């Protein structure tokens with residue numbers, strides 16, 4: 001196809017929850033658009049200074065209906081300046097607001113089997129409080145410079161996505177119910193013409209068709225960020241005590 005000059009603004013809003021192929025999708029969108037896509041990894045590896053800003057936004061987000069709405073929307077736009085898409089926490093819970101701010105953006109929902117999702121979440125993002133692996137995650141997190149404010153953001157952005165005032169994070173049934181309800185609500189809320197639902201394994205074709213772009217030539221659809229790979233990353237951070245000592249060992253993930 002012909003090369004055209006794409007606008008550096010949010011063109012794709014992905015409402016999918018963590019552990020549903022968001023990092024692969026981030027990578028895929030960057031391959032298509034040649035500009036950055038937001039993701040939790042953007043915060044962890046590039047913009048830890050954003051943590052307090054997302055926290056403040058979530059804090060004020062109950063006021064979203066107006067005057068207050070504009071201030072909140074201004075802060076969201078600021079956070080996303082220079083990006084062409086959003087994926088993952090903390091952004092995904094803001095999908096409705098993002099649709100208002102970026103009326104010409106299309107919306108994606110990444111989904112998968114709910115028990116596979118939960119298993120993956122428990123290994124990487126939200127281990128049970130009595131799981132010994134939680135201590136290893138915390139040790140690796142310290143190597144990356146992530147502290148309690150990072151955990152607060154993770155929890156608060158999950159609660160915001162699930163529209164809960166509090167949440168028993170150690171309760172699998174609660175998390176599964178929230179997952180199902182969240183995915184159902186996205187599909188009820190977003191007009192179908194504006195939504196593409198992507199199941200893990202769908203690859204380039206439906207995505208590129210939805211976005212009116214050619215499938216990237218000779219490039220396989222990304223497959224990164226398995227829980228196994230994250231377990232290796234955690235162990236290597238603990239072993240070497242820095243990111244820069246091992247970053248070359250994780251080329252597409254980081």
Ligand SMILES: Nc1ncnc2c1ncn2[C@@H]1O[C@H](COP(=O)(O)O)[C@@H](OP(=O)(O)O)[C@H]1O
Nearest residue numbers: 018019020021022023024120222223225226227
């Ligand atoms: N192209 C692909 N095909 C199949 N699974 C993929 C995939 N890309 C990512 N995944 C899976 O999506 C999950 C990561 O999602 P996210 O980036 O949102 O955290 C991982 O699940 P597992 O942990 O079950 O391996 C990963 O293996």
Ligand SMILES: CC(C)NC[C@@H]1CCc2cc(CO)c([N+](=O)[O-])cc2N1
Nearest residue numbers: 018040088089124125140141154234
């Ligand atoms: C050792 C270190 C790599 N641990 C950091 C972990 C794993 C990456 C990660 C990813 C997400 C969402 O992609 C979230 N999240 O949903 O808040 C939290 C975390 N925290």
Ligand code: NA
Nearest residue numbers: 027252253254
């Ligand atoms: Na990258």
